[PDB]
Design a protein around this motif. Structure first.
Motif, PDB file in Angstrom:
ATOM      1  N   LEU A 344     -88.993 -22.343  -5.056  1.00  0.00           N
ATOM      2  CA  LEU A 344     -88.137 -23.559  -5.170  1.00  0.00           C
ATOM      3  C   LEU A 344     -86.447 -22.952  -4.818  1.00  0.00           C
ATOM      4  O   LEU A 344     -85.798 -23.581  -3.979  1.00  0.00           O
ATOM      5  N   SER A 345     -86.290 -21.810  -5.335  1.00  0.00           N
ATOM      6  CA  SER A 345     -85.124 -21.053  -5.258  1.00  0.00           C
ATOM      7  C   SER A 345     -84.565 -20.701  -3.784  1.00  0.00           C
ATOM      8  O   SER A 345     -85.630 -20.281  -3.326  1.00  0.00           O
ATOM      9  N   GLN A 346     -83.195 -21.007  -3.611  1.00  0.00           N
ATOM     10  CA  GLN A 346     -82.728 -20.485  -2.373  1.00  0.00           C
ATOM     11  C   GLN A 346     -81.841 -19.399  -2.159  1.00  0.00           C
ATOM     12  O   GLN A 346     -81.320 -18.871  -3.399  1.00  0.00           O
ATOM     13  N   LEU A 347     -82.020 -18.575  -1.009  1.00  0.00           N
ATOM     14  CA  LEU A 347     -81.221 -17.324  -1.090  1.00  0.00           C
ATOM     15  C   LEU A 347     -79.868 -17.307  -0.364  1.00  0.00           C
ATOM     16  O   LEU A 347     -79.848 -18.121   0.683  1.00  0.00           O
ATOM     17  N   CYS A 348     -78.951 -16.672  -0.896  1.00  0.00           N
ATOM     18  CA  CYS A 348     -77.529 -16.173  -0.245  1.00  0.00           C
ATOM     19  C   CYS A 348     -77.531 -15.374   0.766  1.00  0.00           C
ATOM     20  O   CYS A 348     -78.341 -14.510   0.754  1.00  0.00           O
ATOM     21  N   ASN A 350     -75.617 -12.753   1.033  1.00  0.00           N
ATOM     22  CA  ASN A 350     -75.350 -11.620   0.351  1.00  0.00           C
ATOM     23  C   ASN A 350     -76.532 -11.026  -0.331  1.00  0.00           C
ATOM     24  O   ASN A 350     -76.605  -9.668  -0.430  1.00  0.00           O
ATOM     25  N   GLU A 351     -77.268 -11.906  -0.887  1.00  0.00           N
ATOM     26  CA  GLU A 351     -78.738 -11.798  -1.597  1.00  0.00           C
ATOM     27  C   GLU A 351     -79.747 -11.460  -0.552  1.00  0.00           C
ATOM     28  O   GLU A 351     -80.391 -10.396  -0.727  1.00  0.00           O
ATOM     29  N   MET A 352     -79.715 -11.825   0.555  1.00  0.00           N
ATOM     30  CA  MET A 352     -80.653 -11.697   1.565  1.00  0.00           C
ATOM     31  C   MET A 352     -80.530 -10.162   2.607  1.00  0.00           C
ATOM     32  O   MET A 352     -81.303  -9.632   2.796  1.00  0.00           O
ATOM     33  N   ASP A 353     -79.099  -9.846   2.411  1.00  0.00           N
ATOM     34  CA  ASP A 353     -78.892  -8.519   3.048  1.00  0.00           C
ATOM     35  C   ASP A 353     -79.311  -7.212   1.752  1.00  0.00           C
ATOM     36  O   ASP A 353     -79.893  -6.297   2.473  1.00  0.00           O
ATOM     37  N   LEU A 354     -79.261  -7.615   0.793  1.00  0.00           N
ATOM     38  CA  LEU A 354     -79.706  -6.678  -0.367  1.00  0.00           C
ATOM     39  C   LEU A 354     -81.096  -6.332  -0.341  1.00  0.00           C
ATOM     40  O   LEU A 354     -81.551  -5.291  -0.261  1.00  0.00           O
ATOM     41  N   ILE A 355     -82.113  -7.518  -0.046  1.00  0.00           N
ATOM     42  CA  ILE A 355     -83.649  -7.216   0.065  1.00  0.00           C
ATOM     43  C   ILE A 355     -83.893  -6.611   1.423  1.00  0.00           C
ATOM     44  O   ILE A 355     -84.745  -5.766   1.382  1.00  0.00           O
ATOM     45  N   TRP A 356     -83.221  -6.910   2.551  1.00  0.00           N
ATOM     46  CA  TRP A 356     -83.509  -6.268   3.807  1.00  0.00           C
ATOM     47  C   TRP A 356     -83.021  -4.676   3.709  1.00  0.00           C
ATOM     48  O   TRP A 356     -83.634  -4.195   4.526  1.00  0.00           O
ATOM     49  N   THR A 357     -82.075  -4.492   3.180  1.00  0.00           N
ATOM     50  CA  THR A 357     -81.548  -3.007   3.097  1.00  0.00           C
ATOM     51  C   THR A 357     -82.590  -2.064   2.301  1.00  0.00           C
ATOM     52  O   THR A 357     -82.744  -0.959   2.190  1.00  0.00           O
ATOM     53  N   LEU A 358     -82.985  -2.939   1.092  1.00  0.00           N
ATOM     54  CA  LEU A 358     -84.058  -2.148   0.107  1.00  0.00           C
ATOM     55  C   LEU A 358     -85.358  -2.637   0.730  1.00  0.00           C
ATOM     56  O   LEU A 358     -86.533  -2.638  -0.346  1.00  0.00           O
ATOM     57  N   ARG A 359     -85.710  -2.864   1.797  1.00  0.00           N
ATOM     58  CA  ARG A 359     -87.052  -3.145   2.240  1.00  0.00           C
ATOM     59  C   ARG A 359     -88.217  -2.096   2.303  1.00  0.00           C
ATOM     60  O   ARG A 359     -89.245  -2.458   1.962  1.00  0.00           O
ATOM     61  N   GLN A 360     -87.766  -0.668   2.430  1.00  0.00           N
ATOM     62  CA  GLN A 360     -88.639   0.482   2.079  1.00  0.00           C
ATOM     63  C   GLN A 360     -88.967   0.620   0.566  1.00  0.00           C
ATOM     64  O   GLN A 360     -90.136   1.230   0.319  1.00  0.00           O
ATOM     65  N   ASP A 361     -87.949   0.279  -0.416  1.00  0.00           N
ATOM     66  CA  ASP A 361     -88.233   0.273  -1.842  1.00  0.00           C
ATOM     67  C   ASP A 361     -89.138  -0.757  -2.268  1.00  0.00           C
ATOM     68  O   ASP A 361     -90.067  -0.872  -3.092  1.00  0.00           O
ATOM     69  N   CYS A 362     -88.947  -2.044  -1.571  1.00  0.00           N
ATOM     70  CA  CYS A 362     -89.812  -3.410  -1.767  1.00  0.00           C
ATOM     71  C   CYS A 362     -91.229  -3.085  -1.391  1.00  0.00           C
ATOM     72  O   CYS A 362     -92.186  -3.161  -2.037  1.00  0.00           O
ATOM     73  N   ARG A 363     -91.414  -2.268  -0.287  1.00  0.00           N
ATOM     74  CA  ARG A 363     -92.690  -1.686   0.428  1.00  0.00           C
ATOM     75  C   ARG A 363     -93.378  -0.809  -0.462  1.00  0.00           C
ATOM     76  O   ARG A 363     -94.798  -0.875  -0.805  1.00  0.00           O
ATOM     77  N   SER A 376     -85.547 -13.022   3.975  1.00  0.00           N
ATOM     78  CA  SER A 376     -84.071 -12.070   3.903  1.00  0.00           C
ATOM     79  C   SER A 376     -83.765 -12.029   5.039  1.00  0.00           C
ATOM     80  O   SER A 376     -82.540 -11.521   5.051  1.00  0.00           O
ATOM     81  N   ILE A 377     -84.280 -12.550   6.287  1.00  0.00           N
ATOM     82  CA  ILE A 377     -83.592 -12.559   7.645  1.00  0.00           C
ATOM     83  C   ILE A 377     -83.614 -14.070   7.831  1.00  0.00           C
ATOM     84  O   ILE A 377     -84.316 -14.946   7.419  1.00  0.00           O
ATOM     85  N   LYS A 378     -82.558 -14.374   8.695  1.00  0.00           N
ATOM     86  CA  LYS A 378     -82.477 -15.857   9.458  1.00  0.00           C
ATOM     87  C   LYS A 378     -83.397 -15.909  10.516  1.00  0.00           C
ATOM     88  O   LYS A 378     -83.379 -17.177  10.861  1.00  0.00           O
ATOM     89  N   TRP A 379     -84.140 -14.944  11.081  1.00  0.00           N
ATOM     90  CA  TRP A 379     -84.842 -15.205  12.128  1.00  0.00           C
ATOM     91  C   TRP A 379     -84.356 -15.342  13.479  1.00  0.00           C
ATOM     92  O   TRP A 379     -84.904 -16.005  14.644  1.00  0.00           O
ATOM     93  N   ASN A 380     -82.979 -15.443  13.545  1.00  0.00           N
ATOM     94  CA  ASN A 380     -82.098 -15.764  14.852  1.00  0.00           C
ATOM     95  C   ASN A 380     -81.924 -14.449  15.615  1.00  0.00           C
ATOM     96  O   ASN A 380     -81.028 -14.404  16.302  1.00  0.00           O
ATOM     97  N   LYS A 381     -82.518 -13.394  15.296  1.00  0.00           N
ATOM     98  CA  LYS A 381     -82.312 -12.046  15.918  1.00  0.00           C
ATOM     99  C   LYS A 381     -83.751 -11.309  16.269  1.00  0.00           C
ATOM    100  O   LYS A 381     -84.515 -11.205  15.168  1.00  0.00           O
TER     101      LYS A 381
END
Ligand SMILES: C[C@H]1Cc2ccccc2N1C(=O)Cc1nc(N2CCOCC2)cc(=O)[nH]1
Length: 855
Positions: A344-348, A350-363, A376-381
């Protein structure tokens, strides 16, 4: 074609009348899957038919306390032949094969035939016990030892099974873009059945670009969005709102094929508005238009058709090609918190950019990060989408419980949903049946007919009849609803074509429920004319009729596909004198015993809430057993068969607190004035060692239902909605509303405490164990908090009045105290437990007062 139509509740000609390419292509594609299932069945012969349809369940494990549980190290079985009423009670060794029962029974018949031409059938169930496996390995025998119950078998001749096999086989045999730099824009022209229009682009919950507002008033205006065609995602939602609210409508940018829509499009808007709205729009709502033929509000819009060649969304090879073109101090503690958050929690930003930059560590380190990584992305790109899709295939399969989260409103993408269903393929049919109610409601959210979810649900339903019968009624209950009539109809048609043999079983169920609907309607009319004593006689006379008897007897129960509903015990059949007049049906037992199979038919009352509550009670009992705690729960069967019509499973030898207080017939109740009725009632049917087992079963069941009613928020508790079985087990009935939408505190009465303490006030040790049991059960439920949230999130599209928005699920977070630590959450539970104990006599008064104001 004609046989399928009557059975599914919708004519096959209605699908052709729509003249839609999506409907025609789905029916064509699913026919290939249906016909392949028919061809695989004709190949299998003799015993192989039972080995696929009704296989014998077996486990190679060992049982605890086997010496004491067995009658001198032997099993006692009761067996009778197809036409013979004479039962044979004999001893059989648990280490021997089921063929030993076959030879020992024929010898007894010969004294007062070969054992190879006989198969063992479970009493009053379409279940079979056969094979070169020991008797102790079989599940039916295993359950009988654990529950103490004696196993009952019916010897069915191989020729009769051959006759059953061949008859079905005859029916089976009878089947013979990215380069485009231009921005996205749509033209608003006319509002036909109108009595300004707001537009915005969405991808689940996320806003793709700034919202566009039209001039206040026929419009003929070009609505330009702050996004290009290249940047637009595949599953992009185009939402509209007319306002003050008048009418709302949602539409997809790309069609089922994946082509960008071009030309004039007519959209039939909806009248009912939800309480919660995102940016004055409804992105949570369905993309399906109003089926009302020229009667509802219509909004005319024109898509850009100026293009020479129709442009489609890039294929899978092109997406990965762009991702490779892009590629060629770390804060772990703050990432770990975001990863551990509930769905249910929403992401900010600044929070979204952190997960996206650390996508390799997440994987590489956390596979459980994917639900948060996809948001982590707005899907607008297009650059952000392509890189995320490339990480999706190389990502390992998530567990089925965590996979269910990727099917809600937050994840609309096809490739994301294709991954989620793939993770759900890992689980068994037994595991799938638990979350089957949620998966059917996901189909309502599904924008296109041909999806990975619909294909997987059909594949499992055709291979397993228990899943098949359940899926049939889940779709048939909402097939008359115009919003999902087309979607639910084509899936129902695909299943019936691939299961021609099961159609005869389903036809008997539809015919039985139609007679029940007629009987319910007859009593509703005769209520004002006839009395209670005369009305009961009118029901008995109606059931005794040849038309009603043949239709309601000798058929498989819609609640439990195994259980066979035999001849109706007319004398025990009754009805409630309430406004909706629900029916109570009692079925006659066979030659062995037995506990009469009961079924409640309710018409006019919504049972969708009851279905969800009992599904949660089943899940709670399952999660408690995984921790090694069997609280002896009774989550009885409930199934919605049609619109405001359904069936309820009856728990044998059970009465309400009100019925226990109002002593039935003449029982030694003088204690006096039937004081402490619950303990005296259990003492009458249980004595000695059995009384100790009845107290133990009560304290475990009471603990489970007290935690369950507090967590789920089951309110309006009284003497008529709480039942006690003769074995000791306590269970709740009639679940009208959920999540405190009838907030709801912990409820405990002295009547329960008196049973737990065994009548003695100075027996604190027994109640102390019960208090710790409630505390233990509450902590196990807290661990699987995210799973309970996920299940309620998938049920938002079901159409429940109590569960509409994300705000309704907030109660579950508060009851489980997920915001507080494990220490403070138990302290919150203890405070409510102590408050319930101090108000135990007050609860006793309120429930007894409820019993007084009756008849
Ligand atoms: C009030 C009782 C007696 C009666 C008589 C005729 C028809 C219906 C009913 N009643 C009910 O419908 C109550 C009721 N009983 C329920 N039970 C399910 C578990 O086994 C026992 C029965 C579940 C439920 O939701 N409501």
């Amino acid at each position: 074609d004609s046989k399928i139509g009557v059975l599914i509740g919708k004519g096959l000609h209605e699908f052709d009348a729509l003249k839609d390419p999506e409907v025609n292509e789905f029916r064509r594609k699913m026919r290939k899957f249906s016909e392949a299932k028919i061809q695989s069945l004709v190949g299998l012969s003799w015993i192989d038919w039972l080995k696929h349809t009704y296989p014998p369940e077996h486990e190679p494990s060992v049982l605890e306390n086997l010496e004491d549980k067995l009658y001198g190290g032997k099993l006692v079985v009761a067996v009778h032949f197809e036409n013979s009423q004479d039962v044979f009670s004999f001893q059989v060794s648990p280490n021997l094969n089921p063929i030993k029962i076959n030879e020992l029974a024929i010898q007894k018949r010969l004294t007062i035939a070969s054992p190879c031409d006989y198969v063992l059938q479970v009493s009053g169930r379409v279940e079979y016990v056969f094979g070169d496996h020991p008797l102790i390995q079989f599940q039916y025998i295993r359950n009988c030892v654990m529950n103490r119950t004696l196993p009952h078998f019916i010897l069915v001749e191989c020729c009769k099974i051959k006759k059953m096999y061949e008859q079905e086989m005859i029916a089976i045999e009878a089947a013979i873009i990215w380069d485009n730099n231009n921005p996205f824009q749509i033209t608003l022209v006319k509002g036909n059945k109108l009595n300004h229009v707001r537009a915005g682009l969405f991808h689940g919950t996320e806003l793709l670009c700034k919202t566009v507002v039209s001039s206040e008033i026929i419009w003929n205006e070009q609505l330009e969005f702050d996004i290009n065609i290249c940047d637009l995602p595949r599953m992009a939602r185009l939402c509209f709102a007319v306002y003050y609210p008048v009418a709302w409508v949602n539409t997809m940018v790309f069609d089922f094929k994946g082509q960008l829509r071009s030309g004039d499009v007519i959209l039939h808007s909806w009248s009912s508005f939800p309480d919660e709205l995102e940016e004055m729009l409804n992105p949570m709502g369905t993309v399906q238009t109003n089926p009302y033929a020229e009667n509802a509000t219509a909004l005319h819009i024109t898509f850009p058709e100026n293009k020479k060649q129709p442009c489609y969304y890039p294929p899978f090879d092109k997406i990965i090609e762009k991702a490779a073109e892009l590629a060629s101090k770390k804060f772990l503690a703050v990432l770990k918190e975001i990863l551990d958050r509930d769905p249910l929690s929403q992401l900010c930003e600044n929070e979204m950019d952190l997960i996206w930059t650390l996508r390799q560590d997440c994987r590489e380190n956390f596979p459980q990060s994917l639900p948060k990584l996809l948001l982590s992305i707005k899907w607008n790109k297009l650059e952000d989408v392509a890189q995320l899709q490339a990480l999706l295939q190389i990502w390992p399969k998530l567990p089925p419980r965590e996979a269910l989260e990727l099917l809600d409103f937050n994840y609309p993408d096809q490739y994301v949903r294709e991954y989620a269903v793939g993770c759900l393929r890992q689980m068994s049919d037994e595991e799938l049946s638990q979350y089957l109610l949620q998966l059917v409601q996901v189909l309502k959210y599904e924008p296109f007919l041909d999806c990975a979810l619909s294909r997987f649900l059909l594949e499992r339903a055709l291979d397993n009849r228990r899943i098949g019968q359940f899926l049939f009624w889940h779709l048939r209950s909402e097939v008359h609803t115009p919003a999902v009539s087309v979607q639910f109809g084509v899936i129902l048609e695909a299943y019936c074509r691939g299961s021609v043999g099961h159609m005869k079983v389903l036809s008997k169920q539809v015919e039985a429920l139609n007679k029940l609907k007629t009987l319910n309607s007859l009593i509703k009319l005769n209520a004002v004319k006839l009395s209670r004593a005369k009305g009961k006689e009118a029901m008995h006379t109606c059931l005794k009729q040849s038309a009603y008897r043949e239709a309601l007897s000798d058929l498989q129960s819609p609640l439990n596909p195994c259980v066979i509903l035999s001849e109706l015990y007319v004398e025990k059949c009754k009805y409630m004198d309430s406004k909706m007049k629900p029916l109570w049906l009692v079925y006659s037992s066979r030659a062995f015993g037995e506990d009469s199979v009961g079924v409640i038919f309710k018409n006019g009352d919504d049972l969708r809430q009851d279905m969800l509550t009992l599904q949660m009670l089943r899940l709670m009992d399952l999660l408690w057993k995984e921790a090694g705690l069997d609280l002896r729960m009774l989550p009885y069967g409930c199934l919605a068969t049609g619109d405001r019509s359904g069936l309820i499973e009856v728990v044998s030898t059970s009465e309400t607190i009100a019925d226990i207080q109002l002593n039935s017939s003449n029982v030694a109740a003088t204690a006096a004035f039937n004081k402490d009725a619950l303990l005296n009632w259990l003492k009458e049917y249980n004595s000695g060692d059995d009384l100790d087992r009845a107290i133990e079963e009560f304290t475990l069941s009471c603990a489970g239902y007290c935690v369950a009613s507090y967590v789920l928020g089951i309110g309006d508790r009284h003497s008529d909605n709480i039942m006690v079985k003769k074995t000791g087990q306590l269970f709740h009935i009639d679940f009208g509303h959920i999540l405190g939408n009838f907030r709801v505190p912990f409820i405990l009465t002295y009547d329960f405490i008196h049973v737990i303490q065994q009548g003695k006030t100075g027996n604190t040790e027994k109640f102390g164990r019960f208090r710790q049991c409630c505390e233990d059960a509450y902590l196990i439920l807290r661990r699987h908090g995210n799973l309970f949230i996920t299940l309620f999130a998938l049920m938002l599209t079901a159409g429940l009045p109590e569960l509409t928005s994300v705000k309704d699920i907030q109660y579950l977070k508060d009851s489980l105290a997920l915001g507080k630590s494990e220490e403070e959450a138990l302290k919150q539970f203890k405070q409510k437990f102590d408050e319930a104990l101090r108000e135990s006599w007050t609860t006793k008064v309120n429930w007894m007062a409820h019993t007084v104001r009756k008849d």
